[PDB]
Amino acid sequence: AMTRYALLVRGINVGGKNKVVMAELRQELTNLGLEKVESYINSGNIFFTSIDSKAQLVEKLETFFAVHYPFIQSFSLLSLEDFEAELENLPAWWSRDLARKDFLFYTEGLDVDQVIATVESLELKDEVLYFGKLGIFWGKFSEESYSKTAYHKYLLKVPFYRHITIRNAKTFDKIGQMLKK
């Protein structure tokens, strides 16, 4: 059955490199046979519909990126049904006005249980996190204490850093909206 997906990528359109023009990428994916292709902002949030199996889509996209955008070396790919399931188990604090709220989306092929063990080893300070099914909800309470959080101090040190796609809560919401189309 036709399924809608969100395809999220990291590390693009920053530092004057890894350039991806959204209009071009939407056209490319349309030309590969993905339907109703849309995007949001410029960090790599792509939505499309397909009847192909998830495994087929992952192989297609891996092949496409390896040839045409080889700096895209990880991506998250999740369905409307996956996201709806996540929306049924949101932390109560996720809706509150914390200073910063980020969602760390897992990517295809990620060793999630190892990520969880690594995150669990960090000593958390003025922050709260919850392991969801598509990624990690991670809230930091205050701009006063932000620089002392494990999020701020240690994320660049973790082995999984380039293999997660990080978005703020505003974009997390928008991803859900765009999946419902």
Binding positions for a second copy, rule: CB under 8 A = 11, 14-17, 22-24, 27-28, 30-33, 41-42, 50-53, 56, 59-60, 64, 67-68, 99, 109, 111, 113-114, 117, 120-121, 143, 147, 152-153, 156-159, 161-162, 168, 170-171, 174
Q: How far is the CB of 72 from Mg ion (least distance, A)?
A: 31
Strand partners, 165: 105
Out of 49, 73, 79, 118, point to the residue binding Cl ion (CB under 5 A): 118
Alpha carbon distances (Å) from 149 to 98, 130, 162: 13, 15, 20
User: Which option in Mg ion, a second copy, Cl ion, none does residue 125 bind, with CB closer than 5 to 8 A by kind?
Assistant: Cl ion
**Which residue from 50, 55, 53, 46 is spatially nearest to 33, judged by alpha carbons?**
50
For 148, phi then psi, to 5°, come to -95, 0
Out of 95, 121, 142, 177, point to the residue binding Mg ion (CB under 5 A): 95
Alpha carbon distances (Å) from 24 to 27, 38, 46, 72, 102: 5, 11, 12, 15, 28
Within the chain, how many helices (H) and strands (E) appear?
6, 8
Q: Which residue, 32 or 85, is less far from a second copy as judged by CB? A: 32
Q: Which residue, 52 or 82, is less far from a second copy as judged by CB? A: 52
d(CA 145, CA 69): 38
Q: Which residue, 129 or 150, is less far from a second copy as judged by CB? A: 150
d(CA 129, CA 134): 13
Q: Which residue is nearest to Mg ion (CB)?
A: 95
Contact residues for Cl ion, defined by CB under 5 A: 114, 118, 125-126, 145, 148, 159-160, 167-168, 171
Contact residues for Mg ion, defined by CB under 5 A: 95
